[PDB]
Amino acid sequence: IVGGYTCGANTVPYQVSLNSGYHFCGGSLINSQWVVSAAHCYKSGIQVRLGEDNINVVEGNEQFISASKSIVHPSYNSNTLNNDIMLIKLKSAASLNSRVASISLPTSCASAGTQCLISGWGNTKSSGTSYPDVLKCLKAPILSDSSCKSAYPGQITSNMFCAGYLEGGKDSCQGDSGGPVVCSGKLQGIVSWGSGCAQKNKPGVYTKVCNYVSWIKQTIASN
Ligand SMILES: O[C@@H]1[C@@H](O)[C@@H](O)OC[C@H]1O
Ligand SMILES: O[C@@H]1[C@@H](O)[C@H](O)OC[C@H]1O
Ligand SMILES: [Ca+2]
């Protein structure tokens, strides 16, 4: 997160860290045994880390649970990042409380102008590199589809939306990938891609979760 603020320990209780020896992506807890992330975060040997603030210090509210199964969307295209979403089943159910909790799936798509909360452990600079150890937060509006398509001609599909600031300075970034975009208490987006971080007229692009609710519910009911 570039241009954000320090969330505060366990104030974003659905935020997960995906770990393969080191943090490499975020994700979102959607019930006690399933996590949603970006398909471009896929790899084998994932441990899901719940209840994290400082990802380098054991502070006492962590649950570390191995993944048992990963399901990349059947139509994921790694060249265009269309359908950039995947599901991860935990080997055991997480213990849910006020500091570890699930986030609700949406019943409708959010409109341009809605304010959302984006969070993660990714890079905090737009020219340079500095990875924080504690979770960072950003409040950002969903942008109109015409501004989104004009920022990224020929690249935005119906499964994507833009959120952020056209003036730059505030954005998600590398290492935030897979993490949540939450708007009015519902998971509306997944940190997916962008050109650089926090560049003028290059807002962040997010997977539009509302298009995937039927696939998620069906997949979970059968696996
Ligand atoms: O983001 C672009 C993607 O949509 C595709 O076209 O490959 C080239 C990239 O620049
Ligand atoms: O859901 C809320 C979101 O819409 C807002 O942007 O940040 C605070 C959250 O509670
Ligand atoms: Ca920790």
Side-chain angles (χ1 to χ4, degrees):
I1 306 291
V2 175
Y5 63 97
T6 299
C7 303
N10 307 120
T11 63
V12 189
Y14 49 84
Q15 178 79 50
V16 322
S17 164
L18 301 188
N19 187 286
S20 58
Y22 52 87
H23 168 83
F24 71 92
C25 272
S28 300
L29 191 66
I30 60 171
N31 63 32
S32 64
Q33 208 155 6
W34 289 88
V35 166
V36 66
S37 192
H40 83 260
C41 291
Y42 165 82
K43 65 173 75 179
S44 69
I46 296 171
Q47 184 182 76
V48 173
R49 299 198 156 193
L50 308 177
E52 285 284 23
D53 188 40
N54 190 312
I55 51 160
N56 278 321
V57 177
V58 178
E59 303 181 289
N61 296 121
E62 296 94 347
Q63 300 173 47
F64 301 165
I65 309 175
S66 285
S68 66
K69 180 182 247 185
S70 285
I71 306 171
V72 166
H73 193 271
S75 297
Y76 171 59
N77 183 329
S78 59
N79 290 320
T80 62
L81 296 180
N82 194 28
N83 301 301
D84 189 12
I85 182 170
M86 92 174 153
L87 291 164
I88 296 161
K89 194 177 179 188
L90 304 181
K91 276 190 183 180
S92 58
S95 194
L96 299 189
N97 54 63
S98 61
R99 293 170 180 271
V100 177
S102 56
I103 184 69
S104 308
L105 283 187
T107 58
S108 57
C109 304
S111 301
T114 304
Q115 194 201 62
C116 305
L117 178 73
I118 308 176
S119 55
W121 285 280
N123 190 3
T124 64
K125 289 183 187 303
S126 53
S127 285
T129 296
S130 173
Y131 285 78
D133 291 334
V134 301
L135 185 64
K136 297 286 185 174
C137 277
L138 178 58
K139 295 186 177 187
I142 293 176
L143 299 178
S144 64
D145 292 318
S146 74
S147 76
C148 192
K149 290 179 73 65
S150 304
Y152 292 108
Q155 301 159 69
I156 302 303
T157 73
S158 61
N159 304 309
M160 297 167 194
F161 66 89
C162 290
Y165 301 88
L166 293 173
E167 60 264 37
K170 303 191 249 178
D171 198 2
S172 55
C173 198
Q174 262 86 18
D176 294 320
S177 285
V181 183
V182 166
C183 323
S184 308
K186 315 289 194 176
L187 186 69
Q188 290 285 351
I190 300 165
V191 181
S192 180
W193 63 277
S195 189
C197 309
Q199 298 300 304
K200 195 169 172 176
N201 286 323
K202 290 291 184 176
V205 181
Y206 298 87
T207 307
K208 196 194 228 171
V209 171
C210 62
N211 285 0
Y212 297 96
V213 170
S214 54
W215 172 74
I216 294 170
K217 293 184 167 175
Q218 289 176 9
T219 296
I220 284 173
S222 309
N223 284 276

